Design an enzyme around this catalytic site. Structure first.
Site, PDB file in Angstrom:
ATOM      1  N   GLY A   1       0.802  -1.221   0.000  1.00 32.91           N
ATOM      2  CA  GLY A   1       0.000   0.000   0.000  1.00 32.91           C
ATOM      3  C   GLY A   1       0.831   1.265   0.000  1.00 32.91           C
TER       4      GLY A   1
ATOM      5  N   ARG B   1       0.626   5.984  -1.760  1.00 31.71           N
ATOM      6  CA  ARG B   1       0.217   7.259  -1.188  1.00 31.71           C
ATOM      7  C   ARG B   1       0.322   7.167   0.328  1.00 31.71           C
TER       8      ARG B   1
ATOM      9  N   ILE C   1       1.028   7.099   4.261  1.00 28.65           N
ATOM     10  CA  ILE C   1       2.081   6.587   5.140  1.00 28.65           C
ATOM     11  C   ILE C   1       3.023   5.645   4.386  1.00 28.65           C
ATOM     12  CG2 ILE C   1       2.496   5.086   7.134  1.00 28.65           C
ATOM     13  CD1 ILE C   1      -0.167   6.345   8.329  1.00 28.65           C
TER      14      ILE C   1
ATOM     15  N   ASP D   1      -2.908  -6.693  -5.088  1.00 29.88           N
ATOM     16  CA  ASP D   1      -4.102  -6.393  -4.299  1.00 29.88           C
ATOM     17  C   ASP D   1      -4.039  -7.097  -2.949  1.00 29.88           C
ATOM     18  OD1 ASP D   1      -6.675  -5.903  -3.305  1.00 29.88           O
ATOM     19  OD2 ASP D   1      -7.671  -7.040  -4.911  1.00 29.88           O
ATOM     20  N   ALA D   2      -4.074  -6.314  -1.867  1.00 29.26           N
ATOM     21  CA  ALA D   2      -3.900  -6.895  -0.540  1.00 29.26           C
ATOM     22  C   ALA D   2      -5.012  -7.884  -0.202  1.00 29.26           C
ATOM     23  CB  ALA D   2      -3.828  -5.787   0.510  1.00 29.26           C
TER      24      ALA D   2
ATOM     25  N   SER E   1      -6.765   3.326  16.564  1.00 27.67           N
ATOM     26  CA  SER E   1      -8.021   2.599  16.666  1.00 27.67           C
ATOM     27  C   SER E   1      -7.841   1.140  17.052  1.00 27.67           C
ATOM     28  CB  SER E   1      -8.782   2.699  15.343  1.00 27.67           C
ATOM     29  OG  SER E   1      -9.134   4.054  15.111  1.00 27.67           O
TER      30      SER E   1
ATOM     31  N   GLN F   1     -16.697   2.432  12.697  1.00 33.01           N
ATOM     32  CA  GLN F   1     -15.551   1.588  12.405  1.00 33.01           C
ATOM     33  C   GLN F   1     -15.659   0.239  13.105  1.00 33.01           C
ATOM     34  OE1 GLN F   1     -13.111   4.982  13.823  1.00 33.01           O
ATOM     35  NE2 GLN F   1     -11.745   4.585  12.105  1.00 33.01           N
TER      36      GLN F   1
ATOM     37  N   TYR G   1     -13.737  -2.036  11.232  1.00 37.21           N
ATOM     38  CA  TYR G   1     -12.367  -1.581  11.019  1.00 37.21           C
ATOM     39  C   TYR G   1     -11.486  -1.770  12.252  1.00 37.21           C
ATOM     40  CZ  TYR G   1      -8.519   1.703  10.246  1.00 37.21           C
ATOM     41  OH  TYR G   1      -7.281   2.294  10.155  1.00 37.21           O
TER      42      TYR G   1
ATOM     43  N   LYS H   1      -7.500  -3.574  13.094  1.00 39.93           N
ATOM     44  CA  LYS H   1      -6.330  -2.884  13.627  1.00 39.93           C
ATOM     45  C   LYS H   1      -5.849  -3.519  14.927  1.00 39.93           C
ATOM     46  CE  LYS H   1      -5.968  -1.417  10.390  1.00 39.93           C
ATOM     47  NZ  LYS H   1      -4.884  -1.115   9.405  1.00 39.93           N
TER      48      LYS H   1
ATOM     49  N   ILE I   1      -3.624  11.337  10.893  1.00 38.72           N
ATOM     50  CA  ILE I   1      -2.647  11.694   9.872  1.00 38.72           C
ATOM     51  C   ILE I   1      -3.390  12.386   8.744  1.00 38.72           C
ATOM     52  CG2 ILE I   1      -0.798  10.884   8.362  1.00 38.72           C
ATOM     53  CD1 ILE I   1      -0.416  10.480  11.436  1.00 38.72           C
TER      54      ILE I   1
END
Lengths: 257, 256, 261, 256
Positions: free
Chosen positions: A13, A16, A18, A67-68, A149, A157, A160, A164, A193
């Site tokens: 990734g 762009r 990080i 593709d992850a 997170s 999230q 999500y 993490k 960020i």
């Protein structure tokens, strides 16, 4: 810089944000960098322009689409790294998505794409890189880019934050499994960020001020704010650091209102 | 060259982690204040480190400042400012762990442990932070805490609260001092072979038992903490504050 | 009868700082659960009055309690409370350490005296109160339970609490280490971590209706806590419902900690 | 009477922690939906639990609903509503831990572990929470996670992320569901003697080694989790949400 001289670094990734900043700084520290991207046209374009910027200051990098969410991508990235540079020494797992969405009406496909990309894809990318590091017998370093997170919740999230926290947990367990082979596994937890302020709108700028007020250091993070911590964890400065996590958030987590 | 032109105060720097951190900061270009306890052994160790540092071209002074004496913070800052004109980094490392059971813990043993490890650290941090705010150029504070900040120890009921307290102090100081560009973080060493536990590790059956619990397969040494401390003191960590970093070879995660 | 529970029947519970706030509510509920309660207070005029009014309420609903003045900053208070408990009730079975102060103050001008009173009251005094209670529990040989009332501030920072959050983190760490030291004697040690609880202390922050609305909007459950919200969790940790819980901590904060903003 | 007339759904309730939690909910007055995998042993265990509960005057039904099948959450809710008129508590307990080394972990095994332990939990919580919101009377959700949510395991690289993910899910759901009075919490059992680890625990030498690491001096039993789960389900925990509770006899804090 020479913190990663003659090391091969895979960053997923990395077109762009990080990952882009991490790949660049690894190249500035002497590493040969595999810039992984999603395989989209924007991903490819960002990966290639990074490769150009790296080539301009004398660095060495290649771009590889992977593709992850495709679980074959780990071995594809390792194979490309070994083909071009002969080794895999550092993995920076950074590819991820966060499609904000409410919990009670979350569709299965969105949930499964988020887990698939952020955690399952990471699992088998780490597995492929770690297999190669063990086979080489020269140690290695693995860095998962997770999030603040991983430690707290978000109402939009629910799909999500478990990925993490999952990534943090994966580094803890891999640290045990791979410690006997000299492979160190750690996680970095970025806070808020920001993207380029010259490209934001007026409304985006009004949200920036409120979020900025929440950070003790007085500013939002930039992608380059993560590069130092990532290179630290990849380097011999962190020779005894494994199974650890590192908040990079300007004090946001501790700043309870 | 991560700390060129920086003045660094390290407390408890005559031996162990503090000695290695002071030497590494000097190798990274810093002017170093070697704080020690004022004892005869502390003074000798700090003197020899200052000479070692001078022998490789670095700059350092030695300063006696008993961490249990709450005046020590301003004495160290005054010595740093007189000798080097600034205070830019504090590495708070002075601490004791006199192992003792809980139910018969002597009051003065408990009070000396809290007084040295936490109370002395509070006012050393305060003195350095005031100078850093006055200079207007930011700064970094690093507390050397312990894996024991996160878990318990039956013979450390007086000690683990001071290590957890140090981590918490860094979290609250990060908020108070963030507007002045002062970053506050903690490092949590695992099992580090030093002079304090050299006799315990002379038992090599014990050493192998302790070593088998570390995924990286070895106990730590003081230079294992030098890298992480210099990292947190440097511009590599410019957005890191209020954070903690285990430096333990995987010990904490390795649930037995 | 009053629909009293029985989770703590025949147990002697010492509660420090029990004249008001969380300590008062914990002491009352322990008595409703059948415990004989030592209502520890500070020795001040206000503390003694609050402890006596609680003792009157407990007596009236058929419970058993006594009030004992014992300044938490005086390291002899732990033994004073245990002696009163043994003399009145014959045992010590549960300690709820709740006495503490939070005198808000900025860091760079923090006076030594204020810092040292905060550590002395919140942590040093708790240490020797836990020590005195745990010694009596060990001597009895019937196990026991120790609950430290800490704070969400054990997990996060506070700019006006640089002297206070380390005492709250320290209390949690004390329970972790005491759990190991005392586990062989059947003594369980846990911490409760209250969030924003409307008590007399933060009376004046909450006086500001606008500040209070902002604080409430940060809690997912949608309200500030009340002292009675801590009574159930404390009684739970003190009881056989938690027979395998030790070395643990429990957030009681309506979701405040997880609700990152 | 902590759960009188409440409808409680427990997944993975034919054996172990889930079976003991379902039994204790019924002892507290709840009407219990006994979720099980649908296997022969799941069916038999759920029936014997239903009869156990009936024998002491409680009310329960058993429902086969493989946690790996994402349809199971709404199957359990529909069965609860038809039998008992509501859903008030969900205890999410179904999970698997097929120990396996990391470097040769097959994709199928990894995906079945995440799919059962985390993905199935997500959509079971979603189904229960939808019904709790529609009723407008609040509710409670309890995820049975593990001490492994906090630490690592070399043979559990696929497993510990699901346990940490469960904890994180309760944290985020606590925010999303707070406005509806639905509290979300996790329990983190330590070493619990169950059918899973039964063969490993017949080695007397290993059982002694595992026991010696628990400060309370014994391994847990499924009943040890029932109290904490009913507490979190009840009005005793009315201000508790987004929280986690170790139930491990001191194992986590007992660092070697």
């Amino acid at each position: 810089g020479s913190l990663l001289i003659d090391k091969t670094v895979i960053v997923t990734g990395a077109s762009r944000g990080i990952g882009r900043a991490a790949a660049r700084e690894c190249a500035r520290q002497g590493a040969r960098v595999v810039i992984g991207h999603s395989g989209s046209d924007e991903g490819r374009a960002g990966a290639l322009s990074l490769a150009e910027e790296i080539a301009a200051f004398g660095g060495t990098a290649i771009a590889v689409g992977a593709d992850a969410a495709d679980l074959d991508s780990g071995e594809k990235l390792v194979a490309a790294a070994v083909e071009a540079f002969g080794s895999v020494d550092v993995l920076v797992n950074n590819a991820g998505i966060c499609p904000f969405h409410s919990f009670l009406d979350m569709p299965r496909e969105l949930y499964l794409k988020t887990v698939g990309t952020n955690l399952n894809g990471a699992y088998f990318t780490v597995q492929a890189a770690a297999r190669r590091m063990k086979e080489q017998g020269r140690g290695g370093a693995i860095i998962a880019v997770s999030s603040i997170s991983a430690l707290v919740g978000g109402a939009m999230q629910t799909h999500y934050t478990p990925t993490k926290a999952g990534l943090l947990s994966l580094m803890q367990s891999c640290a045990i499994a791979l410690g006997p082979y000299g492979i160190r596994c750690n996680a970095v937890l970025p806070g808020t960020i920001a993207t380029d302020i010259n490209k934001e709108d007026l409304s985006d700028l009004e949200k920036r001020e409120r979020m900025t007020s929440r950070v003790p250091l007085g500013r939002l993070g930039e992608p380059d704010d993560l590069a130092g911590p990532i290179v630290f964890l990849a380097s011999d400065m962190a020779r005894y650091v494994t199974g650890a996590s590192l908040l990079v958030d300007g004090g946001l987590f501790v700043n309870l209102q």
